[PDB]
Symmetry: none
Subunit: 196 residues, 6 copies
């Protein structure tokens, strides 16, 4: 499997994408950071413009709400596996979440997938293919799926499939973080910083 | 749903496009500006070139009628959703309003769709697919549609469809802003600078 | 259409192109010049390197004969219309003529198209696709087509096409301007300048 | 033959790739490192950004464990053969393993192919086309193929491929090395470096 | 028509090229120089890499024999017309000759075509399509064509065509010049330098 | 004729290649080197990417055997003639030999053709089209052909042909230079640096 469907890992997020025109796929992301000792964003293959964009957009939300400054770090991103035919989302939230997870040292729940376009300002924007994505997530044996609030009426799931996964709509990045970050002290202290 | 149909949002605009050749679609965009900290236009996905190009072309009236050089900013644009098969306006008036909007901190009416190419002189010039695009504005429950003054004769709706949306033809970008920017003191001061 | 067939309009020039084979097109150029708040030619698309080349060459020629130095100045050059397969002319004289107009604030006869390449010394060099260009100018209802003198013998034109446009051979940039600038005190001031 | 298959070689590793579809290939990487007069990573072709990513992740591995700084050296990464179309794996473990071999002047078992992506911290991450690649370690005649552990279950070999190669699942870069570096003094020096 | 067949012009040279994989065309070039007040080579369309290459090579030749320095000039180059379907010659001598012309102010003979590739050393290297280039030159009413010496055995013309054009084989750039530059004091002075 | 068949020239090498899939061809190359105005590799036409790949792959070796850095010079490469439809060897030995030749001032025997790719470790790796290449070398009236030791079994000469060319298989760079570089004191000195 290319994704983990349970437990908790630092820097790792199950995103979701569409392949060919219908189908959904889990899109697992890994982020790492090392001091740049300005900094670069390192990712390769077909979805790397998407990673640079998600990173550019979270760096500002990171500097603003907390201490750290992404300018001073290299941020090293992979999509775990290869992804031709795959259209990801602009400024994807799973990628920004992985980055936040890596910098804070706080593990992300892998039983939760998510799909979302991040505004610089930290909103969760709607996205396409949302039904086919939640389907892929149901298929991967995932438990929850985070989606933009404005994608709520796009969720076109047969009754049996709405019993199979929780659909948690969000409209800001802090709410994403409350949902997927592992419970503890470090999460408590990050969530505070995020009052607004 | 990928677009919002009422309310005012900063940097957010419901543009109009044509999916393949068959039909119009709403093309909601967000632009956001940050300090450059040389300045770039950041966009991804299938219409990224069109978005950089469009910001390139408008930067003209963005500095020249008003305040800032865009090479002093990073301009962050996204198309809210995925847009394969979609042909986007050259020099789009939606992107230029989105950007002018995000920079001035002046919110834009989401109930008003628009379509047109922005000349380097601030004219709004004719676009194709105007009847299609408006038909999509109508189907999306948008209340008004700004179009090029030159397309006035290409609007070929039925009797019914002509009562459902207000079509507003514009010849210049000041008019587009006048029709979408939120009333306020800030709007007033910005309009007084589109002198002549 | 998107463009302009009669009238006088500043910094806007009905150039001509080929779509590759033998499918002539009217190609409106629009130019705008503002102070750089050095300068730059801001142009988009595949013809942008020709926009720069035509700019360069008209700077030399302008500097030399009016002393006006176009170097503290941002020249925006826009191509009007939605074309692919666009072969353009090196140093194209449409772009040059536009810039001059724009700089000098003197209107251009919209009923006139032109095709040509400009040298640094400001000759008008011959170009491909002369018959096609002239047929697109006819097919657009234009009255006058400026071509290079040396292309005079590459003009064909069947019956359904001769006697249908005034075809104007030129060897120099003042010639081109002499036919297309609007008459008055400023075209007068500037025309003696090229001579001196 | 074109490539190697038998024996031990500084700096060269039989990677595995895909020519897109169901279509695996043996993809040898040769690496060479000189000290610089910082340094840079010289790779050409459609996979050079990945040669850079593989290197950048192994520098972090090497400077933490070993301490060797690879900033002081030019790393030349060459891909063997005229493959077109060719998907690569990010931070590819063949590329890192080649570099490490070059840097520490210790030979690689050619009888082994590998696929995997390397993370900064030294995990080896599951990769696509994993049955395709194993099949091509077979039509090449190789003995072992190293595969990421999290890929076990995307092994689906048939009759005519079952029993033909030794599949080696791994989670960690030390592990990879254990299995391909030639045994002796320098391997043993370098293993304890890590732990 | 796109090229001048007669008389003399500063910075203008009738080159020759092939369209499709046969047919020749006359390829006219203009070069012009302006002080850089660093220099850049300005040229656009499908042949511009060739143009910046011809100039890089004639640079080092101009400097070495004349002292002048193309680094501090802007060199502006056009192909007169658009030349889709066309291959130009590597480093083509018709470009380099238009450049030495522009810079020295000496007219080029418009009634002589030329084809060849210029080495940074001043040698005229052979080229392909030489017969189709010659035919094109004959068809256009050109009187002489300069070709690389090593291309003599590739000149394959019927007897009727032999009579119609002068073929002039060269091996170095100074021969080109001797052959196309207008006669006078400035030519005599230039040729003295290349010796 | 596009190549020389006898004598010795600085920076000139008769490479060998494959025109479409029918047959082999003589690929003559010149390399000239000059001080950098950092250093580039200058090549045009159909095989310019290859040239650059090659000089790129060989520069380590180029620096251990002179001790010039390739970033301290401009390498001007031409293939003499036009070759559309031609597959060059990657990491071409003939391009390395031309370069190394140009830099040392040491002439190369033109009577010797070669084919081969250069490992970053100075090894000569097998290449496709050997019998084909050799057969163009026989028709060209070349006297020897150096090939990879590993293509020794791919040489299917169909005698009379065996008597016409000397086939010299190599496994190392030094041995290519030994077999083509003109005899003298400079060569001897150069051959001595190939070691540990």
């Amino acid at each position: 499997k290319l994704f983990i469907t349970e437990g908790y890992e630092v820097g790792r997020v199950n995103g979701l994408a569409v392949i060919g025109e219908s189908a959904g796929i889990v899109l697992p992301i890994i982020a790492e950071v090392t001091p740049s000792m300005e900094g670069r964003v390192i990712a390769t293959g077909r979805l790397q413009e998407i990673a640079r964009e998600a990173v550019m957009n979270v760096s500002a939300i990171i500097k603003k709400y907390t201490g750290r400054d992404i300018s001073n770090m290299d941020v090293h991103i992979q999509f775990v596996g290869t992804y031709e035919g795959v259209e990801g989302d602009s400024a994807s939230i799973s990628i920004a979440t992985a980055v936040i997870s890596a910098i804070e040292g706080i593990p992300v729940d892998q039983s939760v997938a998510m799909t979302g376009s991040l505004s610089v300002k930290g909103e969760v924007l709607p996205v396409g293919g949302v039904t086919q994505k939640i389907e892929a997530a149901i298929q991967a044996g995932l438990k929850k799926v985070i989606i933009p609030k404005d994608n709520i009426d796009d969720v076109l799931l047969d009754a049996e499939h709405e019993g199979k996964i929780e659909v948690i709509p969000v409209s800001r990045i802090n709410e994403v973080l409350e949902h997927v970050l592992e419970d503890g002290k470090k999460k408590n202290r990050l969530m505070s910083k995020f009052k607004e």
